[PDB]
Amino acid sequence: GDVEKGKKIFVQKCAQCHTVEKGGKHKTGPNLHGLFGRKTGQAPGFSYTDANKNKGITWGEETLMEYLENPKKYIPGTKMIFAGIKKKGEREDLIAYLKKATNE
Ligand code: HEC
């Protein structure tokens, strides 16, 4: 995907609840640094729902593609309020941005 396009998507749809940078703060949602290769619900010091702690998948390109299409269908009972992104390219750009920014 296109990293700079994904940044614009992140800032528009995600940044109000999430930071990405190393040492970034939790907000409404958890900081996402280190997300890739981490299991669900494992950012330290954040009140996750049991739902998000129990989903039990490893976050990566493919599981984020499925999650971001419809978060509540993938993790029923999640307290993340976000409808999803049905568009494929948008998700791919976003995920490419996240794979850079949450690893930098
Ligand atoms: C506030 C209204 C949010 C919006 C906008 C976005 N996210 Fe979110 N996210 C939010 C919360 C409160 C939580 C915890 C949910 C729970 O049930 O505990 C989350 C969680 C995630 C995760 C899982 C993180 C993990 O398992 O460590 C991811 C990958 C995630 N959120 C990504 C994300 C994306 C990419 C967003 C824009 C498209 C987005 N969220 C918006 C709160 C909010």
Author numbering: 1 to 104
Structure paper excerpt:
Cytochrome c (Cytc) is a small, 104 amino acid, essential protein with a covalently linked heme group that performs vital functions in both life-sustaining and cell death pathways. Using purified protein and cellular double knockout models, we show that K39 acetylation and acetylmimetic K39Q replacement increases cytochrome c oxidase (COX) activity and ROS scavenging while inhibiting apoptosis via decreased binding to Apaf-1, caspase cleavage and activity, and cardiolipin peroxidase activity.
As anticipated, given the longer side chain, the K39 acetylated Cytc demonstrates greater variation at residue 39 compared to the K39Q Cytc. Their objectively refined conformations match the conformations for chains A and B in the K39Q structure and chain A in the native protein. Similar measurements with in vivo K39 acetylated Cytc isolated from ischemic porcine TA muscle demonstrated an oxygen consumption rate increase of 58% compared to in vivo unacetylated Cytc isolated from control porcine TA muscle.
